[PDB]
Design a protein around this ligand. Structure first.
Ligand SMILES: C/C=C1\[C@H]2C=C(C)C[C@]1(N)c1ccc(=O)[nH]c1C2
Ligand SMILES: C/C=C1\[C@H]2C=C(C)C[C@]1(N)c1ccc(=O)[nH]c1C2
Lengths: 529, 529
């Protein structure tokens, strides 16, 4: 039967799902590891003891325990990202949408969700791979990994909570996809891992981690790099946050094993309640438990790996959205509110700047302000709001990404860079937010084909085209069958992705990124002598 | 007789000079101090022992010994600024053009020449006050002061060469003008001292020095402030240069009195030959012997005087030209040449930046480059040439001047700011140089009225209008009889001065000057901790 599949782990019974007036198969909730519950919490994942009988893969799995966004209860625009299934520590499952009739051996796309490493679910409506599987005849897998403390608590040196275990869950699912996707019609040598935000940071961390490189062919990174300032922490810093979390829960802190035993006692929601109390600064775009540059998953400083070519050479398609900062300012910067134009006073601008660049001394905060201020219209609240949106985006996504692109492109086998600047016509967020972090995802996954969702003919068009760019790059390592120029360190070409006739540009935010990637760091290092 | 005048010093016999189809009187070369020759070299000036019989004031005086510009022998454009009379240490003389018929008591304008404190002559063709005296019926006096080592060598503590003595010559001439200009038709309570470059720096230093404030009513500062980075040196630094000059002349350096006795032995040209060998850096827009913040002429750091209001409160008219840097890059920056478009390589740009900001560490030079570079077209030689012209102008004239204006305006009784952006149609310098340092001077002095000089009807127009602005401000403390807005620290209004219909603008180069006046200094102070 089209829905019955035999994998090296046992049989799996899928389900037929309708899509655009036709159908496809879906095997939802295939386990890829032993449920990391009990004493296994914080531990590295374990492969799933094979089973007997058919696994019923007819319905989405549980979602990993995680912080639920309650900032705008009832607001679809924020609730669409919240877990839509019972959350549970038993959440390590993967989903596979497969064309019908099952292909013999076609391109695979593995989606890695990316909510700042503290959240994410593979079951979100925007992550429904059926339109993409169906439309581009690719096997689409979306995995799940432990987020938050559960996936990234790190007591380096311990074996009970070594850290990065959420990255190992991803690897484990990549491993399972490698070993079994052939039975579903996929070609395990043409697997493109793609992800957004912390997912794009994950993708890039698989391209760097030695133990992950062989499990995938090429990569797509959306608004995220492994080198983003919020993506990783030193082992010392990761240890510090582990202790503090422990401190917020009244744990014996005499030793790792006491601390870890205490944390394993806590119910999942107790870790989540005090999860944000451990950041070391008042800041926005900083999350608590993230990958630690431990020396195992990452041999060394991401920067030395990047400089030395120590990373998988393949082709990558990456890019950023126009307004990456909006979402984070809205949620944590004073002066921003959802139902107003959030015009910003220079006094709030200065509070935002400081929240956006926590590790900077005053001279640093001084260089940021000088750089993002129109001194000839400095009390302009619209310029200050937008000037802050840029600060947060450039610093956190755009510039660390242009640093990865230029570092990668010197050793990779093809780089394609896009700039998403299209605001969905049916967006329910305030217009001041612009083209928001996470809002290309819906075009990539083809929601604009669902009439009942109300996009515009030009938007459906942009979806089909972006999907064809993703699918076609997954298959051949090139997005083109209007050419999307390859990106070279000399020309710096990239393109716009919007309902208008794409244009090619060069040097995506050079001026600003020279500031963030080259000047600021030098400044912050100088001043400290 | 209209040409015979009796002053408290003796009688003076002038001469009638033609001008624009009419005539006026001129008393040229009236001594205002004892010739500072011999053992008086470096000494403070002395009042001129009165004389008997008429002093023949029918012909221009000698010019103070000074560096002659031989960079473009034969080039009028550079030779027009060179001494046009026998140079001599006996050069302390003043010139007075007086309307005919002699006025009873009219406005006086005293011109202070300004070649970086190392050169200048009151006898230059562009400094011929007759067109201004005649056209605006004002008594025009142009004084002369010792330049170079002769006027600014400073062995602080010595009485033989105390320093600033070139500023005291100016004061002395102001004193003489005060005490005798009534006999020529001037009103000694309506004396406006005006100057360009080192002269505008001198003007502003008279507004600050206690012992000078009472001798003049209001002031006009052209492309110069007392706070320009090249205008003064600490007493320690001034001492250092005195010793080095002495070292270049093989002087006993056992003591000031030996050094000074040696220097008084040297012929004037020997001091001039090694005059530039004492600068402490490889730099452009830095001159050797300049005023020293000694504690007598200047009670304290110009910055504390400015901050505390410790300065003459009156009204001032000041401004800058569009391209203040050209002239200095042409003469000392690699890559610039008079007969080419001087497009600049980024390698030369980097050599220029370093020459332009000598006191900066690498991080400073890094901030300058980041700020003046179009990182999206960085090998553009035209952008790099212009970007350097701006660096030199902003740092050296425009921004230190906007810092004086904002400091002054908080205590002054009226500030009027202009931006000269007009390139004389008959300029013989390369076009890349733009509106050059020193090129408003010819419009201020009304040369554009001399047909035989070939300006355009619109330029003659601009002359008459600028002169009327200078004359009318001298007389009433306001340039207006299209209003030239007053400048306030809140509005920052200034106007353009060019053959086009003047417009009012605000915040002359704020962005850049915030960099030079606020960020760079803070940066350079931070980095050194
Ligand atoms: C635009 C919304 C976002 C993006 C980044 C983060 C950190 C939170 C977020 N709610 C979220 C939550 C879950 C998820 O899968 N992705 C994202 C993307
Ligand atoms: C544009 C030419 C200039 C200006 C500045 C300086 C330093 C030298 C100069 N040759 C000079 C020489 C003599 C003078 O009186 N003024 C000036 C103005």
């Amino acid at each position: 039967s089209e829905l019955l599949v035999n994998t090296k782990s046992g049989k799996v019974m899928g389900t037929r799902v309708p899509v655009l007036s036709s159908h496809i198969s879906a095997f939802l909730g295939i386990p890829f590891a032993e449920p990391p519950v009990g004493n296994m919490r914080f531990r590295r994942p374990e492969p799933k003891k094979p089973w007997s009988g058919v696994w019923n893969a007819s319905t989405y799995p549980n979602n990993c325990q995680q912080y639920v966004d309650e900032q705008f209860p009832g607001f679809s625009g924020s609730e669409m990202w919240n877990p839509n299934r019972e959350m549970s520590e038993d959440c390590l499952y993967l989903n596979i949408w497969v064309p019908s009739p099952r292909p013999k051996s076609t391109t695979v796309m593995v989606w890695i969700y990316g909510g700042g490493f503290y959240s994410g679910s593979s079951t979100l409506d925007v992550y429904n791979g059926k339109y993409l599987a169906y439309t581009e005849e690719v096997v689409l897998v979306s995995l799940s990994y432990r987020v938050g403390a559960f996936g990234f608590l790190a007591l380096h040196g311990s074996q009970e909570a070594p850290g990065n275990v959420g990255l190992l869950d991803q690897r484990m699912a990549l491993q399972w996809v490698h070993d079994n996707i052939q039975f579903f019609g996929g070609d395990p040598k043409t697997v493109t891992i793609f992800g957004e935000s912390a997912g794009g940071a994950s993708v890039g961390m698989h391209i760097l981690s030695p133990g992950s490189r062989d499990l995938f062919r090429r990569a797509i990174l959306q608004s995220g790099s492994p080198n983003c300032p919020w993506a990783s922490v030193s082992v010392a810093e990761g240890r510090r946050r582990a202790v503090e979390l422990g401190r917020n829960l009244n744990c014996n802190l005499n030793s790792d094993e006491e601390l870890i035993h205490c944390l394993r006692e806590k119910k999942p929601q107790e870790l989540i309640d005090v999860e944000w109390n451990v950041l070391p600064f008042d800041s926005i775009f900083r999350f608590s438990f993230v990958p630690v540059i431990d020396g195992e998953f990452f041999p060394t400083s991401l920067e030395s790996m990047l400089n030395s070519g120590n990373f998988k050479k393949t082709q990558i398609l990456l890019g950023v959205n126009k307004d990456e900062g909006s979402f984070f300012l809205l949620y944590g910067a004073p002066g921003f509110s959802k139902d107003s134009e959030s015009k910003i006073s220079r006094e709030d601008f200065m509070s935002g700047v400081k929240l956006s660049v926590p590790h900077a001394n005053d001279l640093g905060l001084d260089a940021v302000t000088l750089q993002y201020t129109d001194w000839m219209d400095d009390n302009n609240g619209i310029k200050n709001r937008d000037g802050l949106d840029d600060i947060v985006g450039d610093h956190n996504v755009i510039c660390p990404l242009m640093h990865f692109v230029n570092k990668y492109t010197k050793f990779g086998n093809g780089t394609y860079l896009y700039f998403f600047n299209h605001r969905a016509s049916n967006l329910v967020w305030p217009e001041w937010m612009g083209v928001i972090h996470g809002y290309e995802i819906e075009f990539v996954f083809g929601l604009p084909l669902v009439k009942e969702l109300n996009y515009t003919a030009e938007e459906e068009a942009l979806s089909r085209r972006i999907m064809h760019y993703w699918a076609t790059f997954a298959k051949t390592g090139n997005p083109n069958e209007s050419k999307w120029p390859l990106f070279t360190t000399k020309e710096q070409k990239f393109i716009d992705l919007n309902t208008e006739p794409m244009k090619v540009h060069q040097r995506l935010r050079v001026q600003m990124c020279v500031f963030w990637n080259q000047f600021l760091p030098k400044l912050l290092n100088a001043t400290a002598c």
